[PDB]
Amino acid sequence: EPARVRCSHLLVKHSQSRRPSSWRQEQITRTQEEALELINGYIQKIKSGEEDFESLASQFSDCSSAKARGDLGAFSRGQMQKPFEDASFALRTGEMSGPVFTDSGIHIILRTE
Ligand SMILES: O=C(O)CCc1nc2ccccc2[nH]1
């Protein structure tokens, strides 16, 4: 295990998220069900090739790392919420997670380093 991984991510928030607003929407109104549908819709478009992970994240991620095309930079263990940390460290570089759940909402993660 490396000390640190670098990942990008795409966050979809929902109305029950820890903090239900984002840079792109003043109040998050979508239900958790709609959030997971969006996430799965993204996974299937990135898989077929119709959409690009980092373009989607710059447009639609509810995390302000959208401005950096999803890039969170490098992080060690003990910094990120545990489910996000665990999914990140289990990816190979270039590999994308399935849906990942944290208090902030639902994520997909791309390990870059
Ligand atoms: O806008 C916020 O409240 C923070 C968004 C957020 N929450 C995260 C949790 C884990 C990793 C990245 C994350 N980005």
CATH number for the domain harbouring residue 78? 3.10.50.40
Nearest Cα to 112, choosing from 69, 79, 81, 80?
69
Q: Which letter does DSSP use for residue 62 in this model?
A: S
Atom of ligand 1 nearest to the CA of 72: 12
- φ, ψ dihedrals at 32, nearest 5°: -65, -35
Ligand 1 pocket test: which of 9, 23, 63 has the largest number of ligand atoms within 8 Å of its C-beta? 63
The residues lining ligand 1, judged by C-beta closer than 6 Å to any ligand atom, are 9, 11, 19, 63, 80-81, 84, 102, 104
Technique employed here was: X-ray
Q: How would you class 81 by CB atoms within 10 Å of its CB: exposed for 0-12, middle for 13-18, buried for 19 or more?
A: middle
Q: Which residues are CB-contacts of 105 (< 8 A; sequence separation ≥ 6)?
A: 11, 12, 13, 14, 17, 35, 62
Distance CA 113, CA 22 (A): 27
Distance CA 94, CA 108 (A): 13
Domain tally, the chain: 1
Please check whether residue 12 is in contact with residue 62, taking contact to mean a CB–CB distance below 8 angstroms.
yes
Q: Using the mean position of ligand 1's atoms as its centre, give its distance from the Cα of residue 32 in Å.
A: 16
What is the extent of the structural domain holding 111?
Answer: 1-113
What type of residue is 1? E
Measuring from atom 2 of ligand 1, which residue has the nearest CA? Answer: 63
